[PDB]
Amino acid sequence: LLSSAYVDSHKWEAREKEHYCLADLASLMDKTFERKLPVSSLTISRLIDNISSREEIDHAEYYLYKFRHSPNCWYLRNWTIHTWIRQCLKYDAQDKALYTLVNKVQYGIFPDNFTFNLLMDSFIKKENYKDALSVVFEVMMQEAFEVPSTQLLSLYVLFHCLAKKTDFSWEEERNFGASLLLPGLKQKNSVGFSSQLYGYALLGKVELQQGLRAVYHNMPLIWKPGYLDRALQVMEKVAASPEDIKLCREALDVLGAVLKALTSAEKLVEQLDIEETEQSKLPQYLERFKALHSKLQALGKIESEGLLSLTTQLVKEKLSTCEAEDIATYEQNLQQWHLDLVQLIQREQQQREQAKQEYQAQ
Amino acid sequence: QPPPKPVIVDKHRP
Amino acid sequence: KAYRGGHLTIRLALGGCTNRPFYRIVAAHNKCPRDGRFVEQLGSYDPLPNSHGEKLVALNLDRIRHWIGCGAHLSKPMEKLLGLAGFFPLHPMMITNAERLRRKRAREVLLASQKTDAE
Amino acid sequence: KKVRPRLIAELARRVRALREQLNRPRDSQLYAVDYETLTRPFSGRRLPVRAWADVRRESRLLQLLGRLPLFGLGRLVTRKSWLWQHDEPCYWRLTRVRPDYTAQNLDHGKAWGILTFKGKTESEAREIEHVMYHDWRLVPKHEEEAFTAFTPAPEDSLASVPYPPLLRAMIIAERQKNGDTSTEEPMLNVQRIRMEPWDYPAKQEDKGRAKGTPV
Amino acid sequence: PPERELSRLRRLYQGHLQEESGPPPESMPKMP
């Protein structure tokens, strides 16, 4: 959905890049690894920047993996990560970019918001929603919903997959629920509040069936019980809100279905016995939901349009504005990254010249 | 999770 | 002998003979033996009642205040002797054991009453 | 006063010290645990029984930090034990993280940060202890505002306590001996005494490290 | 102790709890 200017790579290819041979840099890194010595962040950056073939991407993957297992792993500069994604997209290696993104622990790939949009858009342009879904999950794991452009792209892909998908596994419900709650809080509109309502319904279902621990374990979610309670609070907030905010009927139906399904139907207790369990509060939740549903319908706070239909209209109105802001900030990063790269090259050059002069004196 | 297999190809010097 | 680390501790050194316990309150190093070298004896403690039915405890308070102010620690039994003397507040274990003893005897009364009443 | 020197004693002392640094064990080796038998393969010592439940359920500090940019610098990390024990927010504000590169998953290492224990923030960042413990949890960014929210409570710390019965009598007896006449009861200034919770983090800098002998 | 604090200890020591003890008798009992 991103414009051609946003995904344009002319700016990236116009950087002042020093030409280096991959084999020479690969041989240099091998000698350092055998000596059990740290590898400079400049050396790995040159290796990534000098990728010129599809075959070279596989070789760079190993050294990127080895750099993650080096004492200087934390010094992996951001532009190297962005270049890595740019190289993968350039040589039709989207799977390689996704594989490192899934294995970010083993490779240290932590892209910024701008790069995540580029990777996500490539799957959307090719209608590869299966791979685009994983990218959204990676954003959910890395909590990269601070840019409105990423939030809009995530919502578009997530809602599109929800319509086709019918059977949900407990892991999938946790993933979809978490992946929708994060952008919903940022978006203060009808779609944003619907995502909060829809996301809480999926997470609340996991809490009662699979337990509270499964909700937040290795997830960016709170450990406090009451996901179903927070689902009802969204409806209460919409009930006292301007006419702009509305809740889609699809989200309301899903929450009602979850409550009815739960109503109809390792061993460590993580909650105090004095506190009321969420299972015992199910009849209370059902009574509250029916009252809120009638109140929202009476006030005309229910939107008849589907989630995908309303989200698509939302993208057409705000994506263009968000792209312009991201592009300008991306240009600033390129200027900032270029200055930092020069400093590292100068620092190495001064050290190498200083090392030789001291060696000559000795 | 198997580690990547190290593969080295030499073409700089014929 | 210069031990590695350690500190002075006011403890009880057992004396006397078999079945005749007698503790001398001494200020010795932590790593020293129970009846070994000590810096200064700070009193005595006789756990066996005498002809008057009394347990004699001697507390060299002037020296005890001196060594405690020099960083000397106190063994748990010594912290109870001071609590009994009123030099220190009663140790929580002495209070806790008193509560446990009261509960133990309270349950014994109920068992005794049932035996007499039922049979 | 000439005594035959012991060159080998000094020679052996330097060799042992040098080898303990060159062949020092790493965190991934020292703190690895076999989740089936709940024993550490480095030493073969069984973990305490009370820690068995938390080992299989919770995660280590750098297990969470290995999945974040910059190893999660600037974020807030808490512990399950702190959540159960203290209602007030107890967390660390990370400032510096040193990962263990030898670890395959980079799930071991040390970390520095600012402690916020029971709603009280320390002025200067220091090293974090119990990093290898399977007790840590990660606070979500959207939940940070509610989690960080703390309100101080008025302090009702008693400042004066009665003297023990024998000490009070002697102090009062001293006044009468010196001729001083007063009915005031001597009391201890326990206000200075800053009693701390037993689970308050200690100084990781002053804490030692396990020896290099493997099993 | 407060009710919440007692529940906190029960959650902390699940599976290793003894019967809760009330206040001790005010005076030491004697055998009749």
XYZ file of C-alpha atoms in Angstrom:
742
model
C 0.000 0.000 0.000
C 3.059 2.214 0.375
C 3.818 4.688 -2.395
C 6.695 4.165 -4.813
C 8.501 7.186 -3.352
C 8.414 5.610 0.117
C 9.900 2.318 -1.129
C 12.299 4.072 -3.525
C 15.859 2.799 -3.079
C 17.622 5.539 -5.068
C 18.504 7.401 -1.863
C 20.001 4.265 -0.301
C 22.011 3.456 -3.439
C 23.322 7.048 -3.530
C 25.258 6.682 -0.264
C 29.029 7.185 -0.252
C 29.991 3.507 -0.131
C 33.606 2.347 -0.062
C 34.150 -0.603 -2.390
C 35.458 -3.737 -0.673
C 35.753 -7.375 -1.693
C 33.563 -9.836 0.196
C 36.235 -12.552 0.133
C 38.862 -10.205 1.587
C 36.520 -9.086 4.375
C 35.346 -12.659 4.971
C 38.965 -13.817 5.221
C 39.762 -10.949 7.601
C 36.873 -11.889 9.897
C 37.893 -15.565 9.862
C 41.383 -14.747 11.149
C 39.940 -12.582 13.930
C 37.489 -15.319 14.948
C 40.270 -17.917 15.123
C 42.230 -15.595 17.434
C 39.142 -15.080 19.655
C 39.248 -11.305 19.212
C 36.411 -8.768 18.914
C 35.265 -7.722 15.445
C 34.771 -4.023 14.754
C 31.321 -2.758 13.812
C 32.897 -1.020 10.809
C 34.176 -4.320 9.393
C 30.769 -6.014 9.473
C 29.141 -2.892 8.000
C 31.503 -2.988 5.013
C 30.675 -6.668 4.481
C 26.935 -5.944 4.392
C 27.332 -2.814 2.254
C 29.422 -4.763 -0.293
C 26.782 -7.416 -1.027
C 26.538 -7.649 -4.818
C 24.937 -11.043 -5.524
C 22.249 -13.434 -4.346
C 24.911 -16.006 -3.442
C 26.785 -13.403 -1.380
C 23.728 -13.018 0.872
C 24.158 -16.560 2.211
C 27.828 -15.898 2.984
C 26.949 -12.630 4.731
C 24.309 -14.472 6.773
C 26.961 -16.668 8.401
C 29.170 -13.719 9.352
C 26.128 -11.809 10.605
C 25.369 -14.869 12.737
C 28.996 -14.945 13.892
C 28.935 -11.221 14.683
C 25.921 -11.839 16.930
C 28.156 -14.350 18.762
C 31.014 -11.855 19.183
C 31.993 -9.604 22.115
C 31.076 -6.570 19.969
C 27.562 -7.862 19.249
C 25.872 -4.868 20.892
C 27.738 -2.467 18.578
C 25.756 -3.616 15.514
C 24.918 -0.261 13.948
C 21.400 0.511 12.752
C 22.407 1.318 9.167
C 23.953 -2.144 8.832
C 20.589 -3.694 9.730
C 18.787 -1.397 7.289
C 21.341 -2.211 4.586
C 20.817 -5.921 5.278
C 17.087 -5.615 4.583
C 17.770 -3.427 1.539
C 20.197 -6.007 0.138
C 17.705 -8.833 0.703
C 14.946 -6.926 -1.096
C 17.318 -5.949 -3.916
C 18.304 -9.542 -4.762
C 14.901 -11.216 -4.229
C 15.837 -12.546 -0.794
C 12.723 -11.633 1.191
C 12.740 -15.089 2.792
C 16.308 -14.531 4.007
C 15.269 -11.199 5.522
C 12.297 -12.887 7.199
C 14.422 -15.802 8.427
C 16.853 -13.470 10.199
C 13.918 -11.436 11.532
C 12.349 -14.562 13.045
C 15.793 -15.491 14.427
C 16.617 -11.971 15.639
C 18.167 -13.547 18.745
C 20.655 -15.448 16.570
C 21.346 -12.491 14.244
C 20.606 -9.249 16.103
C 18.214 -7.957 13.434
C 16.191 -5.195 15.138
C 14.939 -2.945 12.325
C 13.411 0.454 12.946
C 9.862 1.437 12.013
C 10.809 2.668 8.533
C 12.509 -0.610 7.598
C 9.620 -2.716 8.920
C 7.215 -0.917 6.580
C 9.458 -1.697 3.599
C 9.648 -5.405 4.442
C 5.914 -5.642 5.143
C 4.985 -3.794 1.943
C 6.994 -6.194 -0.236
C 4.765 -9.093 0.820
C 1.635 -6.965 0.352
C 2.698 -5.926 -3.158
C 3.151 -9.616 -4.012
C 0.000 -10.478 -2.003
C 2.105 -12.641 0.323
C -0.082 -12.175 3.385
C 1.294 -15.382 4.928
C 4.772 -13.853 5.221
C 3.411 -10.381 6.017
C 1.621 -11.843 9.048
C 4.938 -12.958 10.554
C 6.402 -9.463 10.128
C 3.502 -7.955 12.086
C 4.150 -10.489 14.851
C 7.807 -9.431 14.907
C 6.667 -5.821 15.303
C 4.433 -6.985 18.155
C 7.366 -8.775 19.798
C 9.689 -5.791 19.306
C 6.934 -3.262 20.197
C 7.500 -1.056 17.155
C 4.043 0.554 16.967
C 5.264 4.073 17.792
C 4.923 5.279 14.171
C 1.375 5.662 12.772
C 2.477 4.246 9.407
C 3.434 0.927 11.010
C 0.151 0.837 12.941
C -1.949 1.305 9.797
C -0.014 -1.336 7.852
C -0.266 -3.824 10.724
C -4.031 -3.353 11.051
C -4.579 -3.798 7.307
C -2.710 -7.113 7.169
C -4.118 -8.466 10.442
C -7.768 -7.769 9.609
C -7.331 -9.150 6.087
C -6.041 -12.448 7.485
C -8.811 -12.603 10.101
C -11.549 -12.615 7.453
C -10.105 -15.623 5.618
C -8.956 -17.465 8.744
C -11.688 -19.442 10.508
C -10.015 -21.890 12.914
C -7.874 -20.298 15.632
C -5.292 -22.026 17.805
C -4.558 -20.778 21.307
C -1.132 -19.524 20.224
C -2.736 -17.801 17.230
C -5.397 -16.167 19.411
C -2.665 -14.867 21.720
C -0.639 -13.611 18.749
C -3.586 -11.961 16.991
C -4.921 -10.517 20.244
C -1.559 -9.029 21.193
C -0.858 -7.848 17.638
C -4.163 -5.929 17.600
C -4.111 -4.450 21.112
C -0.847 -2.552 20.593
C -1.893 -0.477 17.524
C -5.428 -0.030 18.860
C -4.278 2.065 21.815
C -2.308 4.408 19.545
C -5.138 4.938 17.032
C -7.800 7.214 18.531
C -10.591 6.512 16.056
C -13.301 3.949 15.324
C -10.826 1.355 14.037
C -8.444 1.845 16.959
C -11.051 1.230 19.649
C -12.422 -1.746 17.708
C -8.942 -3.295 17.702
C -8.762 -2.887 21.481
C -12.177 -4.534 21.809
C -11.286 -7.268 19.312
C -7.826 -7.868 20.768
C -9.075 -8.129 24.349
C -11.637 -10.740 23.283
C -8.937 -13.013 21.847
C -6.583 -12.534 24.805
C -9.416 -12.987 27.300
C -10.341 -16.311 25.704
C -6.797 -17.606 26.237
C -6.759 -16.403 29.854
C -9.698 -18.541 30.986
C -8.859 -21.633 28.914
C -5.054 -21.760 28.679
C -4.411 -19.845 31.909
C -3.174 -16.352 32.675
C 0.504 -17.315 32.367
C 0.146 -18.244 28.688
C -1.098 -14.718 27.909
C 1.985 -12.714 28.921
C 4.760 -15.331 28.786
C 7.300 -14.097 26.214
C 4.662 -11.524 25.229
C 4.471 -7.723 25.618
C 1.362 -8.031 27.789
C 0.634 -7.333 31.439
C 0.336 -10.155 33.966
C -2.644 -8.538 35.719
C -5.857 -10.556 35.247
C -8.934 -8.905 33.808
C -8.573 -8.977 30.029
C -12.314 -9.606 29.709
C -12.895 -6.755 32.162
C -10.737 -4.464 30.021
C -12.792 -5.546 27.000
C -15.947 -4.236 28.683
C -14.183 -1.005 29.677
C -13.635 -0.281 25.975
C -17.393 -0.470 25.395
C -18.001 1.769 28.417
C -15.526 4.347 27.098
C -17.218 4.377 23.683
C -20.602 4.845 25.380
C -19.273 8.166 26.743
C -17.475 9.581 23.708
C -18.118 11.914 20.757
C -20.005 10.665 17.713
C -16.731 10.093 15.830
C -15.879 6.998 17.887
C -17.848 3.885 16.924
C -17.404 0.140 17.409
C -17.694 -2.234 14.464
C -20.351 -4.922 14.809
C -17.796 -7.622 13.960
C -15.826 -6.911 17.142
C -19.016 -6.937 19.225
C -20.136 -10.275 17.769
C -16.754 -11.908 18.422
C -16.730 -10.797 22.062
C -20.288 -12.042 22.533
C -19.354 -15.362 20.939
C -16.339 -15.735 23.242
C -18.430 -15.076 26.353
C -21.128 -17.552 25.302
C -18.561 -20.210 24.373
C -16.847 -19.824 27.748
C -20.198 -19.663 29.561
C -21.453 -22.820 27.838
C -18.218 -24.705 28.553
C 2.579 -26.316 36.031
C -0.135 -26.406 38.706
C 0.978 -23.187 40.397
C -1.613 -20.659 41.565
C -0.575 -17.147 40.522
C -3.490 -15.263 42.126
C -4.495 -14.645 45.730
C -7.375 -16.763 47.010
C -9.178 -13.684 48.367
C -9.448 -12.220 44.863
C -12.350 -13.461 42.760
C -11.284 -15.732 39.911
C -12.034 -14.753 36.323
C -14.003 -17.985 35.860
C -16.458 -17.013 38.606
C -16.936 -13.581 36.989
C -18.179 -14.986 33.661
C -21.905 -14.591 34.526
C -21.187 -11.001 35.569
C -19.361 -10.334 32.292
C -22.254 -11.733 30.246
C -24.796 -9.558 32.067
C -22.642 -6.443 31.655
C -22.026 -7.113 27.954
C -25.738 -7.426 27.154
C -26.493 -4.137 28.916
C -23.629 -2.368 27.133
C -24.594 -3.858 23.760
C -28.156 -2.550 24.066
C -26.914 0.849 25.255
C -24.423 1.182 22.385
C -27.028 0.191 19.783
C -29.572 2.650 21.199
C -27.050 5.504 21.009
C -25.965 4.506 17.494
C -22.375 3.698 18.485
C -22.211 0.527 16.349
C -20.653 0.720 12.878
C -22.256 -1.572 10.303
C -19.162 -1.680 8.079
C -16.732 -4.562 8.389
C -13.297 -4.310 9.945
C -11.485 -4.754 6.626
C -13.771 -2.309 4.802
C -13.434 0.427 7.429
C -9.686 -0.119 7.839
C -9.157 0.169 4.079
C -10.910 3.548 4.037
C -8.841 4.638 7.045
C -5.601 3.774 5.228
C -6.560 5.805 2.149
C -6.974 8.932 4.304
C -4.005 8.903 6.708
C -1.282 6.767 5.089
C -0.212 9.525 2.687
C 0.360 12.010 5.516
C 2.309 9.459 7.572
C 4.544 8.496 4.639
C 5.723 12.083 4.139
C 6.794 12.399 7.781
C 8.615 9.050 7.723
C 10.488 9.856 4.500
C 11.825 13.141 5.885
C 12.966 11.438 9.096
C 14.514 8.649 7.014
C 16.479 11.247 5.039
C 17.718 12.728 8.322
C 18.860 9.271 9.440
C 20.786 8.807 6.186
C 22.573 12.105 6.813
C 23.148 11.109 10.445
C 24.313 7.605 9.505
C 26.719 8.973 6.891
C 28.413 11.237 9.443
C 28.845 8.375 11.922
C 30.297 6.055 9.268
C 32.938 8.652 8.365
C 33.950 8.977 12.023
C 34.504 5.222 12.343
C 36.576 5.162 9.142
C 38.650 8.123 10.336
C 39.127 6.555 13.773
C 40.418 3.329 12.216
C 42.639 5.261 9.799
C 44.157 7.356 12.591
C 44.722 4.240 14.708
C 46.309 2.341 11.807
C 48.600 5.256 10.939
C 49.438 5.700 14.627
C 50.138 1.969 14.948
C 52.549 2.007 11.999
C 54.433 5.079 13.244
C 54.879 3.537 16.695
C 55.984 0.287 15.040
C 58.592 2.156 12.982
C 59.981 3.787 16.132
C 60.292 0.366 17.792
C 17.348 -24.475 15.825
C 20.313 -25.696 13.772
C 23.157 -23.200 13.325
C 23.955 -21.951 9.812
C 26.341 -24.151 7.860
C 29.614 -22.282 7.135
C 30.193 -22.287 3.371
C 33.166 -20.494 1.797
C 33.592 -19.913 -1.946
C 36.843 -18.516 -3.359
C 36.652 -16.527 -6.595
C 38.713 -13.374 -5.926
C 41.978 -15.038 -6.987
C 41.644 -17.393 -10.021
C 46.730 -17.602 64.933
C 45.537 -15.107 62.310
C 42.429 -16.568 60.706
C 41.122 -15.435 57.327
C 38.454 -12.847 58.059
C 36.352 -13.660 61.092
C 35.226 -11.491 63.974
C 34.972 -11.432 67.744
C 31.923 -13.181 69.186
C 30.532 -13.269 72.724
C 29.596 -16.920 73.224
C 29.444 -19.662 75.855
C 32.419 -21.951 76.477
C 31.389 -25.260 78.031
C 33.351 -26.355 81.083
C 32.813 -28.713 83.976
C 32.660 -32.479 83.617
C 30.298 -35.045 82.110
C 26.631 -34.413 82.996
C 27.751 -31.226 84.812
C 27.456 -28.406 82.266
C 28.966 -25.010 83.022
C 29.352 -22.173 80.516
C 31.887 -19.347 80.736
C 30.841 -16.226 78.829
C 33.932 -15.251 76.826
C 34.729 -12.902 73.955
C 36.727 -14.934 71.436
C 37.319 -15.012 67.706
C 34.637 -16.636 65.577
C 36.989 -19.245 64.097
C 38.501 -20.258 67.451
C 37.440 -23.519 69.128
C 34.608 -23.470 71.640
C 36.965 -24.015 74.598
C 40.072 -22.568 72.931
C 41.759 -19.188 73.045
C 39.639 -16.197 74.058
C 40.330 -12.477 74.298
C 38.542 -11.779 77.587
C 36.083 -13.745 79.698
C 32.954 -11.648 80.232
C 31.114 -13.730 82.826
C 29.808 -17.179 83.656
C 26.585 -19.161 83.364
C 25.623 -22.140 85.533
C 22.593 -23.931 84.020
C 22.203 -26.351 86.920
C 20.151 -25.030 89.864
C 22.070 -24.693 93.123
C 20.876 -25.520 96.654
C 18.696 -22.385 96.524
C 17.080 -23.440 93.243
C 18.797 -20.666 91.279
C 20.791 -20.466 88.054
C 23.744 -18.129 88.591
C 24.585 -15.831 85.669
C 27.423 -13.298 85.803
C 27.391 -10.406 83.323
C 30.441 -8.122 83.191
C 28.280 -5.347 81.784
C 31.079 -2.775 81.545
C 33.163 -5.127 79.400
C 30.129 -6.465 77.512
C 29.203 -2.932 76.451
C 32.849 -2.415 75.478
C 33.145 -5.427 73.172
C 29.715 -4.946 71.584
C 30.837 -1.409 70.779
C 34.032 -2.826 69.262
C 32.087 -4.935 66.754
C 31.808 -8.225 68.643
C 28.818 -10.315 67.593
C 26.560 -12.314 69.913
C 25.642 -15.979 69.734
C 21.948 -16.842 69.811
C 22.035 -18.393 73.328
C 23.925 -15.326 74.558
C 21.250 -13.058 73.074
C 18.704 -14.954 75.191
C 20.671 -14.605 78.435
C 20.771 -10.843 77.892
C 17.041 -10.873 77.178
C 16.339 -12.804 80.372
C 18.498 -10.342 82.319
C 16.707 -7.403 80.719
C 19.922 -6.084 79.173
C 18.397 -6.746 75.730
C 14.789 -7.039 74.559
C 13.402 -10.557 74.726
C 14.541 -12.526 71.701
C 11.643 -13.302 69.324
C 12.352 -17.032 69.612
C 11.826 -16.918 73.379
C 8.481 -15.186 72.841
C 7.564 -17.494 69.952
C 8.473 -20.638 71.897
C 6.378 -19.359 74.805
C 3.375 -19.068 72.483
C 4.017 -22.552 71.087
C 4.249 -23.995 74.602
C 0.922 -22.382 75.509
C -0.703 -23.897 72.419
C 0.813 -27.297 73.219
C -0.578 -27.296 76.762
C -3.937 -25.902 75.625
C -4.439 -28.910 73.350
C -3.436 -31.229 76.203
C -6.226 -29.815 78.386
C -8.843 -30.610 75.735
C -7.607 -34.201 75.441
C -7.640 -34.611 79.229
C -11.186 -33.245 79.534
C -12.557 -35.614 76.881
C -11.092 -38.677 78.611
C -12.680 -37.761 81.951
C -16.045 -36.713 80.506
C -16.580 -39.478 77.940
C -15.121 -42.139 80.250
C 67.840 -13.175 59.610
C 68.082 -15.081 56.318
C 65.525 -17.754 55.396
C 65.601 -19.993 52.333
C 63.113 -18.480 49.850
C 60.387 -20.500 48.142
C 60.586 -19.602 44.453
C 58.177 -22.365 43.422
C 55.574 -21.117 45.911
C 55.611 -17.716 44.204
C 55.890 -19.376 40.786
C 52.880 -21.609 41.468
C 50.845 -18.703 42.854
C 51.246 -16.653 39.670
C 50.507 -19.635 37.411
C 47.263 -20.458 39.228
C 46.118 -16.828 39.158
C 46.909 -16.494 35.447
C 45.120 -19.727 34.518
C 42.017 -18.743 36.503
C 41.753 -15.691 34.229
C 42.692 -17.290 30.900
C 40.515 -20.356 31.588
C 37.756 -18.575 33.504
C 34.312 -20.185 33.163
C 31.616 -18.181 31.414
C 28.081 -17.407 32.545
C 26.585 -19.738 29.930
C 28.644 -22.573 31.441
C 28.360 -21.661 35.130
C 24.618 -20.950 35.171
C 23.367 -23.548 32.689
C 20.658 -25.726 34.238
C 19.169 -29.026 33.063
C 15.423 -28.434 33.345
C 14.679 -32.170 33.615
C 16.820 -33.048 36.646
C 17.051 -29.424 37.899
C 20.825 -29.734 38.308
C 23.624 -27.569 36.944
C 25.868 -29.599 34.591
C 28.900 -27.463 35.482
C 28.953 -28.572 39.134
C 26.264 -31.243 39.471
C 24.614 -29.514 42.441
C 20.841 -29.706 42.772
C 18.955 -26.428 42.989
C 16.918 -25.712 46.137
C 13.452 -27.249 46.187
C 11.637 -23.919 46.512
C 13.294 -22.697 43.296
C 12.079 -25.677 41.244
C 8.708 -24.136 40.366
C 10.161 -20.803 39.233
C 12.930 -22.359 37.117
C 10.506 -24.225 34.856
C 8.091 -21.278 34.507
C 9.878 -17.915 34.595
C 12.768 -16.627 32.484
C 16.243 -15.251 33.074
C 16.943 -11.533 32.788
C 18.887 -11.731 29.526
C 16.452 -14.255 28.059
C 14.100 -11.281 27.754
C 16.912 -8.859 26.874
C 18.118 -11.042 23.997
C 14.945 -10.247 22.033
C 15.109 -6.440 22.250
C 17.063 -3.724 20.428
C 20.218 -2.631 22.270
C 19.438 -5.495 24.683
C 16.514 -3.453 25.990
C 18.406 -0.403 27.225
C 16.221 2.131 29.006
C 13.347 -0.283 29.654
C 11.915 -1.528 32.957
C 12.317 -5.116 34.180
C 10.692 -6.656 37.258
C 10.684 -9.997 39.075
C 7.901 -12.423 39.944
C 9.024 -12.576 43.578
C 8.818 -8.782 43.786
C 5.330 -8.859 42.258
C 4.101 -11.372 44.839
C 5.896 -9.865 47.838
C 5.462 -6.121 47.225
C 2.353 -4.330 45.996
C 4.484 -1.261 45.287
C 6.252 -1.225 41.892
C 9.710 -2.791 42.155
C 11.741 -2.667 38.952
C 15.123 -1.893 37.408
C 15.664 0.866 34.836
C 18.399 -0.617 32.659
C 21.414 1.506 31.713
C 24.133 -0.947 30.629
C 24.006 -4.614 29.604
C 26.972 -6.946 29.077
C 25.857 -10.072 27.174
C 27.718 -13.376 27.181
C 28.780 -13.928 23.570
C 29.716 -17.561 24.270
C 26.047 -18.370 24.895
C 24.246 -19.709 21.834
C 21.095 -17.693 22.581
C 22.899 -14.807 24.355
C 20.692 -15.450 27.394
C 23.423 -14.923 30.017
C 25.461 -11.959 31.179
C 25.476 -8.973 33.511
C 23.455 -5.766 33.519
C 23.536 -2.321 35.125
C 20.589 -0.093 35.914
C 18.735 2.127 38.356
C 16.860 0.324 41.124
C 13.324 1.386 42.063
C 12.426 -0.717 45.109
C 8.991 -0.231 46.712
C 8.525 3.058 44.879
C 11.882 4.516 45.961
C 14.410 5.353 43.243
C 18.153 5.238 43.845
C 20.166 8.236 42.695
C 22.955 6.398 40.849
C 22.857 3.312 38.648
C 24.703 0.224 39.859
C 25.148 -3.419 38.929
C 22.138 -5.741 39.076
C 22.250 -8.946 41.120
C 20.350 -12.216 40.647
C 20.521 -11.791 36.867
C 20.866 -15.539 36.253
C 17.779 -16.242 38.381
C 14.675 -17.531 36.595
C 12.575 -14.770 38.129
C 12.502 -11.821 35.706
C 9.560 -10.394 33.772
C 9.429 -7.612 31.183
C 7.098 -4.629 31.599
C 5.287 -3.721 28.346
C 5.771 -0.184 27.067
C 2.037 0.558 27.013
C 1.752 -0.772 30.580
C 4.750 1.289 31.752
C 2.660 4.359 32.592
C 0.349 2.401 34.902
C 3.145 0.205 36.282
C 5.557 3.075 36.974
C 2.772 5.096 38.643
C 3.659 5.311 42.343
C 2.406 7.572 45.133
C 4.516 8.021 48.289
C 2.913 7.317 51.645
C 3.372 9.356 54.846
C 6.077 7.918 57.085
C 4.975 6.591 60.485
C 8.369 5.230 61.540
C 8.600 5.243 65.330
C 11.581 7.265 66.533
C 11.730 6.428 70.259
C 11.387 3.014 71.911
C 11.600 2.111 75.622
C 14.936 0.909 76.925
C 15.265 -2.726 77.994
C 14.367 -3.091 81.675
C 17.903 -3.441 83.048
C 19.451 -0.704 80.896
C 16.743 1.822 81.785
C 17.206 1.164 85.504
C 20.972 1.682 85.306
C 20.665 4.909 83.296
C 18.112 6.291 85.760
C 20.316 5.137 88.646
C 23.232 7.025 87.083
C 21.217 10.257 87.102
C 20.357 9.913 90.795
C 23.979 9.112 91.665
C 25.152 12.276 89.891
C 22.407 14.268 91.633
C 20.321 14.883 88.514
C 16.583 14.733 89.233
C 14.252 14.147 86.286
C 11.237 11.947 85.575
C 11.899 11.679 81.830
C 12.088 8.128 80.499
C 15.239 7.417 78.448
C 14.443 6.205 74.943
C 16.384 4.878 71.966
C 16.626 6.968 68.791
C 15.623 4.179 66.410
C 14.790 6.818 63.786
C 18.366 6.642 62.482
C 18.029 2.873 61.997
C 16.937 2.379 58.369
C 15.473 -1.116 58.452
C 15.439 -2.616 54.968
C 13.408 -5.458 53.439
C 15.312 -8.734 53.335
C 14.742 -8.990 49.565
C 16.324 -5.599 48.874
C 19.013 -6.009 46.182
C 22.574 -6.190 47.472
C 25.845 -4.996 45.924
C 26.647 -7.211 42.944
C 30.057 -5.515 42.784
C 31.014 -6.949 46.187
C 29.656 -10.419 45.339
C 32.058 -13.169 44.319
C 32.074 -15.667 41.476
C 32.113 -19.453 41.266
C 35.435 -21.216 40.803
C 36.620 -22.630 37.490
C 36.621 -26.318 38.441
C 34.302 -28.202 36.044
C 32.434 -31.458 36.544
C -1.778 -10.361 60.679
C -3.982 -8.834 57.970
C -6.030 -11.144 55.777
C -4.233 -10.053 52.601
C -0.822 -10.781 54.135
C -1.933 -14.280 55.150
C -3.122 -14.942 51.593
C 0.209 -13.671 50.257
C 2.084 -16.225 52.367
C -0.273 -19.002 51.252
C 0.411 -18.139 47.610
C 4.146 -17.927 48.314
C 4.244 -21.351 49.992
C 1.696 -23.377 48.016
C 1.753 -27.063 48.910
C 3.827 -26.495 52.075
C 1.298 -24.864 54.403
C 0.446 -25.731 57.999
C -2.832 -25.095 59.784
C -3.128 -21.398 60.587
C -2.672 -20.575 64.269
C -4.829 -18.107 66.164
C -3.747 -15.943 69.094
C -2.114 -17.978 71.871
C -3.801 -18.421 75.259
C -3.342 -15.431 77.543
C -2.080 -17.644 80.391
C -0.144 -20.895 80.568
C -2.577 -23.822 80.966
C -2.151 -26.497 83.619
C -3.082 -30.168 83.759
C -6.143 -30.698 86.048
